[PDB]
């Protein structure tokens, strides 16, 4: 790479792997448009597998950005609209709470209060039902934002029930192989194991545990190479031939909901740039991220903005990602780690990259 990207690449990401003792990273900046790769040491440490541009990490919530361009793909299609109920597409939801709460309320968790995480208890499809049947929410639909897997898991949900598909099929056909992520996966198969990284809590290998809605919340595994190409689709939509696929990832970085200097999309945060890096940076933090908010609603809601900072923190027990863009730039990046550490420092490393190449 150009000694300048490998330079600030490298004078920022070692120390962060050494502070925070991550075991194998994998980075990708995407600068005028081309991808390039960084990694660090080990995939699997017992075995000695170091990371490569095939190994796999464990996105975790950054699987909501592919979850709201699935679904922004699904309004395009003319499947589904975000105005509608969420009744129209599950009947059985008859709980009085639910009249008012639409499909964009669960998208961008201004449902009202619905929980963080789906109770390890659910299991079936009917205690799935019983579970929102019974929630009570705190706060009328579209006043406060409350991150929640809980909310944009149903969106994933009940965007994919026209199409007839599977969540994991539609994903599959209609943004995976369309943009050639060959190697994204909702459930790694056995042929691919072999580049399946361990994640590591407390110094121990782990691997994300089975839930209810984890796939379209936070299960998705990739590689540096495809994440580099999830950004590239990001960054410019318009080269995508896939027209309803196109239009679904402009849809996913409107901007719905403000809360501070924070814009709500579908699946992705965007905030105007040039950022204050103290706004992102701090906000990021589980203090900021995952408190509860009052919102602005921005009616209607504003088309992608190309001078945004756009970015998904996600995590896992055993693994910590981040992505941000800023289309207007053509600049993007990539963290992958095996170990899942604060939020901030994986902020405050991408914006140092990316404010030093312009």
């Known amino acids: 790479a150009p000694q300048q990207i490998n330079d600030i690449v490298h004078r920022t990401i070692t120390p962060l792997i050494e502070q925070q003792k991550i075991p194998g990273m994998a980075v990708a900046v995407i600068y005028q448009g081309k991808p390039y790769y960084f990694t660090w040491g080990y995939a699997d440490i017992a075995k000695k597998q170091p990371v490569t541009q095939q190994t796999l990490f464990e996105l975790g919530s950054v699987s909501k950005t592919f979850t709201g361009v699935l679904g922004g793909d699904a309004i395009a299609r003319g499947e589904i609209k975000l105005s509608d109920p969420t009744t129209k597409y599950w009947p059985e939801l008859t709980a009085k709470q639910w009249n008012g709460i639409t499909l964009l309320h669960l998208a961008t968790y201004t449902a009202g209060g619905l929980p963080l995480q789906v109770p390890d208890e659910v299991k079936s499809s009917s205690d799935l039902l019983r579970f929102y049947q019974n929630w009570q929410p705190a706060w009328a639909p579209g006043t ?96 995508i031939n896939e027209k309803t696929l196109q239009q679904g990832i402009q849809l996913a970085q409107s901007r719905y909901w403000q809360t501070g200097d924070m814009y709500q999309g579908l699946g992705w945060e965007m905030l105007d740039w040039p950022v204050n890096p103290d706004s992102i940076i701090n906000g990021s933090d589980n203090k900021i991220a995952l408190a509860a908010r009052p919102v602005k609603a921005i009616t209607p809601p504003t088309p992608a903005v190309r001078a945004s900072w756009v970015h998904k923190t996600g995590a896992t027990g055993g693994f910590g990602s981040y992505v941000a863009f800023i289309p207007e730039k053509e600049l993007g990046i990539v963290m992958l780690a095996n170990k899942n550490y604060p939020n901030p420092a994986r902020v405050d490393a991408a914006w140092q990259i990316l404010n030093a190449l312009q």
């Not at 072999?194 to 809605?213: C, F, Q, T």
């Open 144 to 239: 406060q934002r409350l991150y929640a897997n809980s909310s944009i898991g149903l969106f994933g949900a009940l965007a994919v029930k026209p199409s007839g598909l599977s969540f994991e099929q539609a994903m599959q056909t209609r943004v995976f192989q369309p943009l050639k992520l060959n190697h994204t996966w909702i459930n790694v198969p056995p042929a691919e194991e072999k580049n399946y990284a361990w994640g590591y809590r407390e110094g121990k290998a782990v691997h994300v545990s089975p839930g209810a809605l984890d796939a379209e919340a936070y299960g998705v595994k990739s590689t540096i190479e495809d994440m580099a190409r999830w950004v590239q689709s990001n960054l410019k939509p318009l080269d």
